[PDB]
């Protein structure tokens, strides 16, 4: 019953077509209703429609006249219905169609030529039916068809005389997934005019039948091939033989429970560019296993190797120089595996490798020596992902071989050590270092001295020792733009900690114990660590137990755009504390103990605010405490989410629970 010029009447239990819909609509959506029929008359009014979606209904058959009533119809969706019988008239007059969806209609067989007048059809979908044959006509039609979906059917064999009807057709996708096919007739694929992508996913094949398939794909125009979950136990140099006569670029062999990959298995793929091998059971990756895959650019090995048997000590072995053939490999996804460790010549050869994901790729890579990543000496690696690898120690000069490294993720580990600074030696192109979620980091003065070009530093929940050093550990980080020090429960911080970080824009300091530093009773006075941060943009100071705020803490934060002081015990704020925040756009003070909001404090702050968040607060509902605040609320343009529901007063008890 809604209209965006696209009428959406979904889930309305309509037993008959609405007759009050505007004549401006071009798309009609009638999914999930109780329509028994679709009379042409009821659509005579809607002669300007271009898209009709009547999926999920109880429509038995269609009237031919209906197709005449919609001359501008491009997309016809008849999915999930009782449309079991098709005729030559049913889709005859819908010659302007481009998309036809016919999934889940319990169609046991398509008779003659119901699709002979669909010469403008691009995508034909017949998924989830009882089709035992790929034959859809007795002549050559559907010349402009690109995508044919016969997935999830009872199709057991592909024959030539059933497929040649697309001889003048150019198919980019032949979806035959979830089909128990057991035979490929000779010349059944050559019968197609143009075949670019074949999809035999979830299709019980085997090495031999796969070999036969590749044989029948020889000398074809195939570009994409999907054999996911085809139960391909093992591969040999004969398996993908026919593919020698193809210009195949993408191959998907995922979920095949692939146990053994024989030598020169993919030597017949010199044109292959994208290889998907994720989720498998490879026990031993031999040397010549990836022989002749020099044009491969993307390689996915996520969970491709067998898990640890613990008792049988069955760890997946990778021979040295197993990647030396992928000269043009650029993206390597080896995450989530049980590999023992990185051999001296593991990644030797990948002279174009730019991305390496080793997240949980190893059983236990507990120590990173200077000889660990020696196999990445001649690789132009830019992004290295070493999360979830149970790393406990990073020795000196460990990342020396990765001179071009930009992004290093060392988070999610057991890393507990002192940052000597020698860890980062060689990193002259480093941009961001992730260390979040670890054991402990004992900082020194020369911890980050060797990487002054670092711009993002993530130390979220890692326990910072000696962070209260007089020459800041962060001191050499001049170009540091983002600094995360949250969830570390830091109890002491010197004023000179952020000194030298003039380019710092984003600062995360939530969930620590910094309240003691902002009380006036603090021995030596309050700690003004935010002095000099001219280019500071986003500041997070939530969950610090703050109950006092010195008047001149945010005095030098001119470019400060966002400030988050939520989840604290704040109550009384000094006057003119936000007086210098001229670029302030977002103010957060939710879940506090604030009772009063006066002009002398929140005056200059509320000036150009676009987002204010003071949700859960025990407001004191008297004149001298809420007058100016309410007066500002009633006239402000500042977006204040959940203003009516979650803004309640506590005292006096008369206004207890009152907005």
């Amino acid at each position, epitope marked *: 019953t809604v209209s965006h010029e696209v009428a959406d009447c979904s889930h309305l239990k309509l037993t008959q077509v609405p007759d009050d819909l505007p004549t401006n609509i071009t798309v009609l959506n009638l999914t999930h209703n109780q329509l028994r029929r679709l009379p042409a008359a009821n659509f005579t009014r809607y002669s300007q429609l271009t898209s009709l979606d009547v999926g999920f209904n109880t429509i038995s058959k269609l009237e031919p006249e209906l197709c005449q009533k919609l001359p501008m119809l491009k997309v016809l969706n008849l999915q999930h219905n009782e449309l079991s019988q098709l005729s*030559d008239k049913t889709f005859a007059f819908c010659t302007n169609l481009t998309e036809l969806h016919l999934m889940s209609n319990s169609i046991q067989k398509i008779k003659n*030529n119901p699709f002979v007048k669909q010469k403008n059809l691009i995508t034909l979908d017949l998924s989830h039916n009882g089709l035992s044959s790929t034959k859809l006509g007795t*002549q050559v039609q559907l010349e402009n068809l690109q995508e044919l979906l016969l997935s999830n059917n009872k199709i057991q064999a592909l024959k*030539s*005389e059933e497929l040649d009807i697309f001889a*003048n057709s150019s198919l980019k996708k032949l979806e035959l997934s979830s089909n128990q096919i057991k035979e490929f007739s000779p010349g059944c694929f050559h019968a197609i005019g143009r075949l670019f992508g074949l999809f035999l996913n979830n299709v019980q094949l085997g090495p031999s039948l796969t070999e036969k398939l590749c044989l029948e794909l020889a000398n074809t125009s195939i570009r994409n091939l999907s054999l996911s979950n085809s139960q391909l136990s093992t591969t040999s140099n004969t398996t993908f033989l026919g593919l020698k006569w193809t210009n195949l670029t993408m191959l998907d062999l995922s979920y095949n429970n692939l146990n053994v990959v024989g030598n020169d298995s993919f030597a017949w793929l010199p044109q292959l560019e994208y290889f998907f091998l994720e989720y498998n059971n490879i026990q031993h990756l031999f040397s010549h296993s990836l022989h002749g895959l020099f044009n491969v650019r993307y390689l996915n090995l996520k969970r491709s190797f067998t898990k640890q048997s613990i008792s049988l000590a069955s760890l997946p072995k990778i021979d040295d120089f197993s990647f030396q053939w992928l000269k043009c490999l650029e993206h390597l996804n080896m995450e989530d595996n049980d590999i023992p460790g990185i051999k001296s010549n593991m990644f030797t050869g990948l002279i174009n490798l730019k991305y390496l994901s080793l997240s949980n790729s190893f059983t236990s890579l507990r120590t990173l020596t200077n000889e660990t990543f020696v196999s990445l000496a001649h690789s132009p690696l830019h992004i290295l992902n070493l999360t979830k690898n149970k790393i406990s120690k990073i020795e000196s000069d460990a990342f020396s071989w990765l001179g071009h490294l930009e992004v290093l993720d060392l988070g999610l580990n057991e890393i507990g050590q002192e940052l000597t600074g020698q860890e980062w030696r060689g990193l002259e192109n480093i941009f961001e270092i992730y260390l979040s979620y670890n054991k402990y980091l004992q900082l020194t003065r020369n911890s980050f001295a060797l990487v002054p070009s670092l711009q993002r530093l993530m130390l979220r929940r890692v326990a910072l020792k000696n962070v209260d050093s007089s020459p800041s550990p962060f001191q050499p980080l001049r170009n540091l733009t983002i600094l995360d020090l949250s969830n570390n429960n830091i109890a002491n911080i010197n004023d000179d900690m952020l000194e030298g970080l003039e380019k710092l824009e984003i600062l995360d300091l939530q969930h620590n114990n910094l309240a003691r530093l902002w009380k006036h009773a603090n021995p030596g006075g309050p700690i003004y660590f935010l002095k000099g941060l001219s280019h500071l943009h986003i500041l997070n100071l939530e969950s610090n137990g703050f109950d006092e705020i010195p008047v001149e803490v945010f005095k030098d934060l001119f470019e400060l755009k966002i400030i988050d002081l939520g989840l604290n015990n704040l109550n009384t704020l000094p006057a003119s504390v936000f007086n210098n925040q001229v670029s302030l756009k977002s103010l957060n003070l939710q879940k506090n103990l604030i009772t009063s909001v006066e002009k002398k404090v929140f005056g200059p702050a509320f000036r150009n605010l676009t987002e204010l968040d003071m949700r859960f607060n025990p407001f004191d509902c008297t004149c001298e405490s809420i007058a100016w605040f309410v007066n500002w609320i009633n006239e402000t343009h500042t977006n204040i989410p959940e203003l009516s529901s979650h803004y309640l007063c506590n005292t006096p008890p008369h206004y207890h629970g009152f907005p």
Partner: antibody
Amino acid sequence: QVQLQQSGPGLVKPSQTLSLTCAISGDSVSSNSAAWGWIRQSPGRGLEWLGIIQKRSKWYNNYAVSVKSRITINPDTSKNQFSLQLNSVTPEDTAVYYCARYSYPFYSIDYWGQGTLVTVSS
Amino acid sequence: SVLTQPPSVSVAPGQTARISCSGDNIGSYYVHWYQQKPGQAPVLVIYEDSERPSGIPERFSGSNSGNTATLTISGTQAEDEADYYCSSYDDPNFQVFGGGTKLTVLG
């Protein structure tokens, strides 16, 4: 225009082989948007379907259950014709034979042959 | 599907002539009507049950619904007396005809 010129022997003895030929002009035998075939009319105004042939990738042919394994319709791209062969003929196979051109999509016949008469008498 | 046509149908000169074609759910198929005079080859007068071939008079119109496919000739003349057959390909049988109707122009 599309002209169909039929020809063949006038008399065919029992248990012999009936032969016929349909020549085509103004159109090609090996082309799409065009099927071909044979249709006989028995004396007594009985219009009966014999067989069809058509080209998609290869040449596919379909016959009637009446003619069983006696009929054989083979096209010839060489001379631009198509022949008809009926083996083991009985006296009731005597009829007026017309070669037919089937028009796509729905097999209506816009073009018939002038017809030729075959007789089984011995 | 067995197509059943009436044996003979007669009509007065200048009147409307209607020939029926009965079959199980024949409304699902595109029927075709051929006209044949004795001694000549049958010529198509109706294709796709409603369309007239190029050169066919507009007197001939056709309809197809339910179990009946009807051929209709308004302004029946002397030249229209002949045989009429309805046809449809359907299954691999590829062409099914009817019993044949004999149109008779009256005295």
